[PDB]
Amino acid sequence: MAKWVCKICGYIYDEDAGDPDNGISPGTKFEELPDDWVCPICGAPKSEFEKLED
Numbered sequence: 474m475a476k477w478v479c480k481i482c483g484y485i486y487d488e489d490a491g492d493p494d495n496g497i498s499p500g501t502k503f504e505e506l507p508d509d510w511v512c513p514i515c516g517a518p519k520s521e522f523e524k525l526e527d
């Protein structure tokens with residue numbers, strides 16, 4: 474699945490991994506993350522992520 478980078482801190486949201494410690498099971502697409510999910514490292518909103526693809 475896809476990877477998305479936090480443009481602030483460099484954390485990668487990997488859809489295959491999810492973010493279980495913050496309520497997100499593996500295989501959750503970025504677009505399916507709750508509106509108030511934030512970068513687990515720096516707190517940036519979803520607006521500050523970019524999909525890693527061309």
Ligand SMILES: [Fe+3]
Nearest residue numbers: 479482512515
């Ligand atoms: Fe971040």
